[PDB]
Structure formats: structure tokens, C-alpha cells
């Protein structure tokens, strides 16, 4: 059960469906990761669906779920509930494509590196490049979650969460 890994999967599938967005369960790590992805231009944006914002959303998809009921729309309702159980809230992720028809995703791939048992930490001197430095590693440092480029600039090491390109 690796939540960060399961988010990468969802993201990828939604992309392959040519979807505009998708929801994922809240997490503070996930949020710092999405913030890297947004900052680097790999996603368009992401929203925390809390307070008044969560209400708004549920109504909308509810409305839409209700007219011309095509499959794969009630799911969002479904999803929108289990993600707000407890102290936790749903994240709405807005996907970025380059072309109007959404055939060219900003994300070519996104893959978990560090995992259970098979941890991957990089030191100051051994901070990896991704795709010749055209992609990114997302790394958890003692100064926050950031790119390999930034970790290097900050002369820091950390756990390598993911490669993205």
C-alpha cells in the first residue's frame, strides 16, 4: 500500500483517457509533490477541496452525474466522498496537455523510485539527473520536497521519491 505510487497511476490513466482532471486522496506529502509538478509545468494546477470549495464541487458533479447519465461520472461523486473521510480532503488535479486535442501530455511518464524496503536516498554528491537533465527527480530533503536541480543548488541530499519527464 503505497499512496504516492497509487497517485502516479491514477494520474497516468487519466492522462491516457485524455481527461481534464482527476481527484486523489489528501496527503501533505502528495501536496508538496503536486506543488513541484505545478511549478515545473507538468500539471496545470491542483486544488484542495475543503470548506466551501468541497461543497461547490460535490453539487456540480452531482448535477452533471444527473443529466445524460454516461458511465464514469457517478464515480467522481463516489471518489469525492471516500477522500474526505476523517481529517482528510480530496485533491482535484488539473492536467496539462500541450495541444487543444489533448494528444500531447505534459507528462510523458512518472515513476516511483524509493519504495518499501527498497529505499532510495541520494547524497549531496550523488544527486541523480533524469533524462540528461531534461526530466526531474522529485526529492524529499530536510528542507522540503523539491527538484533535483534545486536540491543541488541548495547543496542537499534526500529521498528520491520519483522520476518525471
**Domains in the chain, please, with CATH?**
1-107 (no CATH), 108-165 (3.30.1490.10)
Q: Using CA atoms, how far apart are residues 19 and 95, in angstroms rounded to an integer?
A: 7
Q: Are the CB atoms for 122 and 160 separated by under 8 Å? A: yes
Long-range contacts of 44-49 (CB under 8 A, 24+ apart): 44/94, 44/95, 44/96, 45/93, 45/94, 46/91, 46/92, 46/93, 46/94, 47/91, 47/92, 47/94, 48/89, 48/91, 49/23, 49/80, 49/83, 49/84, 49/89, 49/90, 49/91, 49/92
**Among 76, 72, 20, which residue's Cα sits nearest to residue 46?**
20
Q: What is the SS3 string spanning the chain?
A: CCHHHHHHHHHHHHHHCCCCEEEEECCHHHHHHHHHHHHHCCEEEEEECCHHHHHHHHHHHHHHHHCCCCCCCHHHHHHHHHCCCCCCCEEEEEECECCCCCCCECCCCEEECCCCCCCCEECCCCCCCCHHHCCEEEEEEECEEEEHHHHHHCCCCEEEEEEEC
> How would you classify residue 101: left for phi > 0, otherwise alpha for psi between -120 and 50, otherwise beta?
alpha
> Which residues, in sequence order, are CB contacts of 97 under 8 Å at separation 6+?
18, 103, 104, 105, 106
Resolution (A): 2.2
Method underlying the structure: X-ray
Amino acid at each position: 500500500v503505497d499512496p504516492i505510487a497509487d497517485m502516479f497511476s491514477a494520474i497516468k490513466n487519466a492522462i491516457m483517457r485524455r481527461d481534464d482532471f482527476l481527484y486523489v486522496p489528501s496527503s501533505k506529502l502528495k501536496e508538496r509533490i503536486l506543488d513541484v509538478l505545478k511549478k515545473e509545468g507538468f500539471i496545470q494546477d491542483w486544488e484542495a477541496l475543503k470548506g466551501e470549495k468541497y461543497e461547490e464541487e460535490y453539487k456540480k458533479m452531482k448535477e452533471l452525474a444527473e443529466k445524460s447519465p454516461n458511465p464514469k461520472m457517478k464515480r467522481y461523486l463516489k471518489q469525492l466522498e471516500e477522500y474526505n473521510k476523517g481529517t482528510q480532503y480530496p485533491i482535484k488535479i488539473y492536467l496539462k496537455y500541450l495541444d487543444p486535442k489533448k494528444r500531447k501530455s505534459a507528462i510523458t511518464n512518472i515513476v516511483k523510485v524509493s519504495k518499501g524496503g527498497r529505499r532510495v536516498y541520494a547524497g549531496v554528491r550523488t544527486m541523480p539527473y533524469v533524462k540528461r537533465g531534461l526530466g526531474i527527480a522529485i526529492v524529499s530533503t530536510d528542507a522540503g520536497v523539491m527538484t533535483d536541480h534545486e536540491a543541488r543548488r541548495m547543496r542537499k541530499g534526500g529521498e528520491v521519491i520519483a522520476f518525471v519527464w
